């Protein structure tokens, strides 16, 4: 078998800008303020019009007033402008406000919306679960006394995806979302998320790429070239899958017959027997090491532990967080809450088992659904029908969620927080609608 090489750089988009001047002054605007991808579009369209990496930069250019290529896909023309392109999103919260104003101004330019006072359209926001009150007050500020939006409402994007795949609005289910920086498990009864019993794991997919960076740097402390973080996402989203059973795989993952098909070798760009030695199998794979070759110094020999990176959402103790995995959280939800005991299931628990949805940008790792359904049938009673639902692309289905909430008129008008209600009630106010957040107390 001839050993192949894998160059990881990602290409540059040559056409960044596309917008239309014709627009509807009464149709609302649906935007998903994702940690990884900004999504933008109208209401009448089924698919989101604009997909962006939610990042912006401040390019300093001499003799042209030092302010160019600010927001969006314009950073994707050159690697130099994409290098310092600062996504303002921290772990839980975005950080800078003028940056987010520039994101909103750029995307409002990209629907061709003309001024009419501030903005003549209602907005459709996505809000993270258990949001800090200061964030929601400053969100109220940056809509109302910044853009003059008449209609604001926001909710959990996983609940939006559940409403998208269950448009009836009164179904019972369990949604397991894995976002860029956060994963959570939320039970929905009668269309209403019982956030009181929802749980959260602080891993997401950003910490998975950070874990791969830390692993592959600790494996090779003397690597010649600096491995870029974008290339870490690139070779994470390509060679990482979830095993069916993690316990019996790691005792097989470094055998000689398994290394022929499991191991893929990546190549970084530039310009005493080894068979009995399992350190040679771990470091240099099923091929003998040529220490004089300039390729083998740059050979980024991954895939020996490609199972370890996506498994950590089931065992968060390998990631450093002392939290029970989504398997244990689903077990506690389906076997200890809503009147259900270990041994007999309530009807709500059976309906929740019969409708399980997984979504998010980190859900497109292969082997997730089979592992989820095998682990679910591990602890559930025999004969209980388990249905796990998946999307073709589970990252942008939340946008279809607020689109489906926008098509429904009477379900739109329950959740609308207006300017007048904000003015009489102050910025400390939460509409306890079912498709979103709730009060901190009773």
């Amino acid at each position: 078998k001839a050993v192949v090489i894998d160059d990881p750089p990602l290409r540059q988009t040559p056409e960044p800008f596309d917008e239309q001047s014709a627009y509807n002054p009464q149709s609302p605007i649906a935007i998903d303020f994702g940690s990884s991808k900004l999504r933008a579009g109208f209401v009448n369209h089924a698919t989101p019009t604009h997909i962006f990496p939610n990042a912006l930069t401040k390019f300093r250019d001499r003799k042209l007033n030092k302010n160019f290529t600010f927001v969006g896909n314009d950073t994707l023309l050159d690697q130099a402008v994409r290098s310092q392109s600062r996504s303002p999103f921290d772990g839980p919260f975005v950080t800078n406000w003028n940056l987010t104003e520039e994101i909103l101004d750029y995307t409002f330019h990209h629907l061709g919306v003309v001024p009419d006072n501030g903005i003549p359209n209602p907005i459709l926001l996505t809000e993270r679960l258990a949001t800090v009150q200061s964030q929601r007050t400053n969100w109220y500020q940056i809509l109302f006394e910044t853009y003059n939006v008449p209609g604001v409402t926001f909710g959990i994007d996983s609940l939006f995806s559940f409403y998208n795949y269950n448009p009836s609005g009164n179904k019972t289910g369990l949604v397991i979302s894995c976002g860029h920086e956060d994963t959570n498990v939320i039970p929905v009864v009668d269309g209403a998320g019982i956030l009181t019993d929802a749980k959260r794991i602080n891993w997401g997919g950003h910490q998975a790429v950070d874990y791969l960076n830390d692993l592959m740097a600790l494996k090779y402390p003397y690597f010649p070239t600096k491995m870029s973080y974008l290339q870490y996402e690139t070779m994470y989203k390509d060679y990482c899958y979830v095993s069916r059973n993690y316990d019996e795989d790691i005792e097989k993952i470094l055998t000689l017959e398994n290394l022929d098909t499991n191991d893929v070798v990546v190549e970084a760009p530039f310009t005493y027997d080894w068979r009995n030695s399992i350190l040679h199998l771990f470091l240099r794979g099923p091929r003998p090491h040529d220490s004089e070759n300039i390729h083998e110094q740059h050979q980024m020999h991954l895939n020996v532990e490609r199972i370890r990176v996506p498994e950590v959402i089931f065992q968060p103790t390998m990631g450093g967080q002392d939290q029970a995995g989504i398997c244990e959280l689903s077990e506690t939800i389906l076997l200890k809450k809503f009147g259900s005991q270990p041994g007999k299931l309530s009807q709500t628990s059976i309906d929740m088992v019969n409708n399980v949805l997984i979504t998010g940008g980190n859900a497109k790792v292969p082997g997730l659904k089979e592992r989820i359904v095998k682990e679910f049938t591990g602890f559930l009673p025999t004969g209980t029908n388990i249905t796990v639902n998946m999307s073709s692309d589970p990252s942008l289905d939340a946008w279809k969620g607020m689109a489906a909430l926008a098509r429904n008129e009477e379900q739109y008008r329950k959740t609308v927080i207006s300017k007048k209600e904000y003015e009489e009630y102050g910025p400390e106010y939460i509409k306890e609608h079912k498709l979103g957040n709730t009060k901190y107390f009773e």
């Binding site: 772990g91 909103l104 494996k219 316990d247 005792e251």
Partner: protein, 128 residues
Amino acid sequence: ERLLFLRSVGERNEIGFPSRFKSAHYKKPTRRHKSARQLISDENKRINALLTKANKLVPKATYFSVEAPPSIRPAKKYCDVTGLKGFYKSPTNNIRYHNAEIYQLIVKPMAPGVDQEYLKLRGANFVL
């Protein structure tokens, strides 16, 4: 010669200091660059202030009640460098290793200051 291409694509999205998506009474503030660390703790300060001013009130859904509890089953122990089963833990630097060859080639000749990263990946970095 690709610099003028960059100014050409940048010569389409200027937003003036009076922005055209403004509410005509917009006054941008000088709010500080708040990090993601102290926001959790001053929410926590707000919650203790509210509960001490109320009890002299069970919370429904805050950022802390949403947190998943730690697991009740014992966690599987893994090798700190190879990722396989960790049968043994070295008594000196507290690294869990796989077998004899990893112990003699990695764990024993490990320099001081290299154990902290291996424990930090597991979340056991005791050095603060």
